[PDB]
Structure formats: structure tokens, C-alpha cells
Design a protein around this ligand. Structure first.
Ligand code: SNA
Ligand code: MG
Ligand code: MG
Length: 297
């Protein structure tokens, strides 16, 4: 069981060993499209690229490249799109992807302004009366409403394809207090956030894959999806103790590199899954318990 596994790993102080083993066994696939000279300004980081086999392709003739990967978890029956924080020149591409992939939600785990440097562009409207128009992709984005909490904000946006004038409601879940290469304040606050995303219906199979991003789209976003997928698996299998989080992470790493960037993020993932299991195994009391422990605004 992960409960006992966590315990032994924690007692012996071997998180660095398990994490390094994961990095060592992680899949290696080519990223030739991402490294093409013409795509240099579409990547935020030189060392973070999507594999060619799982990258999301924009439905356009000019250039179909966007630093985004489709994570398809077969057993868990859920897919996620992990991408970098949009750049000033890829904001239109980002929303084009959301439209073409039919996503209902966008999960943001970073802040536009991190440790001084801008790890992400302001790709959504901050005011209702100031909508955004992405000329290159012919899309319009309007802020409909926003619910601000102490450590996260939920926004309701309207995305319109200016070509067909059809519109769609997109839910934006922004976790505002998760540092780069850091962890959430507590398993409770993280789980409260995750379950808010689940309850919104954004992760339903009737919609396209949820779009999850942070700065590079691998550390924080990897942690988020790993925890969700593991909880999903525990709920499906006849044996909830059969879930090997290390194995699930490696499966996820077949679709995008570097998911989960620190030994501590790995440790936290265990904690989130362990605590979350309490809700999955009945006892729907923990649900409201996390809400209280997270001290929302
Ligand atoms: C798995 C690998 C993990 C390595 C961690 N690296 C650094 O943190 C970052 C990327 C990065 C940032 C943030 C995270 C995160 F975990 F916090 P997140 O995923 O949760 O957002 C994960 C990764 N890279 C960096 O800061 C680098 C690294 C590098 O390539 O040396 N600089 C570059 O991206 C900056 C850079 C350097 C050189 C070029 C060039 F060669 F193309 P040019 O001179 O010709 O313009 C382009 C861009
Ligand atoms: Mg106002
Ligand atoms: Mg309002």
C-alpha cells in the first residue's frame, strides 16, 4: 500500500532516491518539431518541449506548432492537455487549441508574475468591459464573472470563434499560491481545488481534455494530473491499494517530459492521493473538511 510505502520512504529519507530512479527510467522520445528553428519563439524554455508523437497540432496551414502535449490515460479513461504558460505571441494559438480540442476548462497553477520575472502572459481579460481579441486566430475572449478565494480564483469566460460567431463557456481555475518548484500549502487546499474542478464538470468525458498549465507545464501541472489520475484509478479498481503512483507517473511521462520536478513534489503527490483516498473510500465528510482546512476567502 502507498500508505506504508510512503511511511518507509519517509522514515528512511529516500525520496531523492525514488525520484532519481523515476528520472532515470523516464521515456525518451524525439521532439523534432519543437526544435525546428521556425518554432523557437513558440517555446518558453529551451529544455522543455513536447514529444512529437503526443504533441497537440493546431488546425492551421501556416504553422501547427504549440508547446502542448496530450496525456491519454487509458485505464483511468481520462485525457489531459499539458502546456506551457502562453507567451505574448502564442496567446492566440493557446485559445485556438482550447477551441479546436473542445476543452471546457483551463487549469492554471502559476502566476503571471513569479519571483519578479514573468513566467506567463496575461492571456485572459481582467475586466468584464475589456474583452480580448486574438487577431491571428480570429477569436474573442470575454470575462463573464470571477469568484476570488484566498488561494485560488474561478473565472467564467466566453470564447467566441469570430469566423462562425459560435460561442462557448470556458471555466478558468487559477491556483494562485503554488510556487515554481514548490508545493501547495497542504493536501487539503490542493484537494479542495481539484474537487472544485471535478465538480464543475470540466473533466467530464463529454468535453474535450482539460487544459492544464503552469510555467513550463511539467512540474506543477504534472503533480496535478498525477494526483487526479491516481484517485481515478483507486475508484475504478477492485483493489484501491493496487495503485503504484511511481508506475502511473512513468506512464504519464511517456506523453510529456519531466512531469513532477522535485522529490518534494513527488512526496506531496503521495500525500494528496493518500488523503484523497479517504473521500473515495466513502466517508464524504472529508470533502467539507478540506474546504475548512484550506480556509478559502
Ligand atoms: C526536466 C528538465 C528540468 C530543467 C529545469 N530548468 C529550468 O528551470 C527552466 C525550465 C523550467 C521552468 C519552470 C518549471 C516548473 F517546474 F517550475 P513548472 O513546470 O511547474 O512551471 C520546469 C522547467 N529552464 C531554464 O531556465 C533554461 C534551461 C536551459 O535550457 O539551459 N533556460 C532556457 O529556457 C532559456 C533559454 C536559453 C537559451 C536559448 C537559445 F539556445 F535558443 P538562444 O540563446 O539561441 O535564444 C532559448 C531559451
Ligand atoms: Mg469593474
Ligand atoms: Mg460578477
Amino acid at each position: 500500500e502507498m500508505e506504508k510505502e510512503f511511511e518507509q520512504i519517509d522514515k528512511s529519507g529516500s525520496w531523492a532516491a525514488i525520484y532519481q530512479d523515476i528520472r532515470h527510467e523516464a521515456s525518451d522520445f524525439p521532439c523534432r518539431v519543437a526544435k525546428l528553428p521556425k518554432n523557437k519563439n513558440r517555446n518558453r524554455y529551451r529544455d522543455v518541449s513536447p514529444f512529437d508523437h503526443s504533441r497537440i497540432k493546431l488546425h492551421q496551414e501556416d504553422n501547427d506548432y504549440i508547446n502542448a502535449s496530450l496525456i491519454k490515460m487509458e485505464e483511468a479513461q481520462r485525457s489531459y492537455i499539458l502546456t506551457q504558460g502562453p507567451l505574448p505571441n502564442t496567446c492566440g494559438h493557446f485559445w485556438e487549441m482550447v477551441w479546436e480540442q473542445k476543452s471546457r476548462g483551463v487549469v492554471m497553477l502559476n502566476r503571471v508574475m513569479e519571483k519578479g520575472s514573468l513566467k506567463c502572459a496575461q492571456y485572459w481579460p481582467q475586466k468584464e468591459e475589456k474583452e480580448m481579441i486574438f487577431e491571428d486566430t480570429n477569436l474573442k475572449l470575454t470575462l463573464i464573472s470571477e469568484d476570488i478565494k484566498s488561494y485560488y480564483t474561478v473565472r467564467q469566460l466566453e470564447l467566441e470563434n469570430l469566423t462562425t460567431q459560435e460561442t462557448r463557456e470556458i471555466l478558468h481555475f487559477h491556483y494562485t499560491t503554488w510556487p515554481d518548484f514548490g508545493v501547495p500549502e497542504s493536501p487539503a487546499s490542493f484537494l479542495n481545488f481539484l474537487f472544485k474542478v471535478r465538480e464543475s464538470g470540466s473533466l467530464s468525458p463529454e468535453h474535450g481534455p482539460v487544459v492544464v498549465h503552469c510555467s513550463a507545464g511539467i512540474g506543477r501541472s504534472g503533480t496535478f494530473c498525477l494526483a487526479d489520475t491516481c484517485l481515478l484509478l483507486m475508484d475504478k479498481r477492485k483493489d484501491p491499494s493496487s495503485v503504484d503512483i511511481k508506475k502511473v507517473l512513468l506512464e504519464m511521462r511517456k506523453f510529456r517530459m519531466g512531469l513532477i520536478q522535485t522529490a518534494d513534489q513527488l512526496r506531496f503527490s503521495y500525500l494528496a492521493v493518500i488523503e484523497g483516498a479517504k473521500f473515495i473510500m466513502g466517508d464524504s465528510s472529508v470533502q467539507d473538511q478540506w474546504k475548512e482546512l484550506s480556509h478559502e476567502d
